[PDB]
UniProtKB/Swiss-Prot annotation:
InterPro entries: Ribosomal_Su5_D2-typ_SF, UDP-acyl_GlcNac_deAcase, UDP-acyl_GlcNac_deAcase_C, UDP-acyl_N-AcGlcN_deAcase_N. It comes from the Bacteria. GO terms for cellular component: membrane. Gene3D superfamilies: lpxc deacetylase, domain 1, lpxc deacetylase, domain 2. Pathway: Glycolipid biosynthesis; lipid IV(A) biosynthesis; lipid IV(A) from (3R)-3-hydroxytetradecanoyl-[acyl-carrier-protein] and UDP-N-acetyl-alpha-D-glucosamine: step 2/6. This is UDP-3-O-acyl-N-acetylglucosamine deacetylase.
Length: 299
């Protein structure tokens, strides 16, 4: 049987918001079966809880933001990508501020902290959303698609229109039947271009962004003295973002995602279109893990 998973132990981390630059304390806690992933603003009295679900996404400018009335949890995509990669169904995420800490810009620190704490299998069937029909959303030259697939596969393609790529459209495919999320995706850091500094300053964004927690590009130069973690780090980070954004479905996917310049906004529009088109998907469980089209690492 493929079982639901939670954390075996609590995880505690400190860091800064990429966008806010605020110091934030993070605690991940075990949760019961069918809780899903629930963010808690514990700096507020009373505490404000926001389920990590597509319907609670409020802003998708330069991150995925959860919103309940006036309350936000910004930049959830990198932590949710870690939780999706390791198959965590149920957890409370407590935050002392409005934004998940950026850590090193990747999902690496989160997968390491989680795998250090360990996972706990729970006595309940893991529920999957199985893609049964093709579902496409487009806006301009941006496109995001779900395709039926017996497994979980992500493709991303983007023409960054930026000199640092030396005129090359970036493309990557990962199939979690062979690709290690941990080894091949989790280390891919977020990035910023020095040419967007005017605009980011003007939206009060990326206040915590530096070479410490991101790839920083200035025209031709990667400013980071120690360089890239992957030849294709930039596009592997878009795949990491897409895995986090897709986890707002609230259950792991059986299917394929293809992204064409898609961002947080179009990723969320795809989830909403999918959820509305009930002909395109069904909830499935696997009573026997041996015949399932996906597997997870030992807990
Ligand atoms: C002075 O260093 C900087 C400046 C800006 C950033 C920066 C990062 N981001 C977030 C970038 C995006 C939206 C991302 O990772 N989302 O999860 S991406 C790479 O998909 O386009 C941003 O809006 O600004 C940075 F990381 C470092
Ligand atoms: Zn990102």
């Amino acid at each position: 049987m493929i079982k639901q998973r939670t954390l075996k132990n609590i995880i505690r981390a400190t860091g800064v918001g990429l966008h806010s630059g605020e110091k934030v304390y993070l605690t991940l806690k075990p949760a019961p079966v069918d809780t899903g992933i629930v963010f808690s603003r514990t700096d507020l009295d009373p505490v404000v809880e926001i389920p990590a679900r597509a319907e609670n996404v409020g802003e998708t400018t330069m991150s995925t933001t959860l919103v309940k009335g006036d309350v936000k949890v910004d930049t959830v995509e990198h932590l949710l990508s870690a939780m999706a990669g390791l198959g965590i169904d149920n957890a409370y995420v407590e935050l002392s501020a409005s934004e998940v800490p950026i850590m090193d810009g990747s999902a690496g620190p989160f997968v390491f902290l989680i795998q250090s704490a360990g996972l706990q299998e729970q006595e309940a069937a893991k529920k999957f959303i199985r893609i049964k029909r093709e579902v496409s959303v487009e806006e301009g030259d941006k496109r995001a698609v779900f395709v039926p697939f017996d497994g979980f596969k992500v493709s991303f393609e983007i023409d960054f229109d930026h000199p640092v790529f030396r005129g090359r459209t970036q493309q990557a495919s990962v199939d979690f039947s062979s690709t290690s999320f941990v080894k091949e995706v989790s280390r891919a850091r977020t990035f910023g271009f020095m040419r967007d500094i005017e605009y980011l300053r003007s939206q009060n964004l990326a206040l915590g962004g530096s070479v410490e927690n991101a790839i920083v590009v200035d025209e031709n130069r990667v400013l980071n003295e120690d360089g890239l973690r992957y030849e294709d780090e930039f596009v592997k980070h878009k795949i990491l973002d897409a895995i986090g954004d897709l986890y707002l479905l609230g259950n792991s996917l059986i299917g394929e995602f293809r992204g064409f310049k898609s961002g947080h906004a179009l990723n969320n529009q795809l989830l909403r279109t999918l959820i509305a088109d009930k002909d395109a998907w069904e909830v499935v469980t696997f009573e026997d893990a041996r015949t399932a089209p996906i597997s997870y690492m030992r807990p």
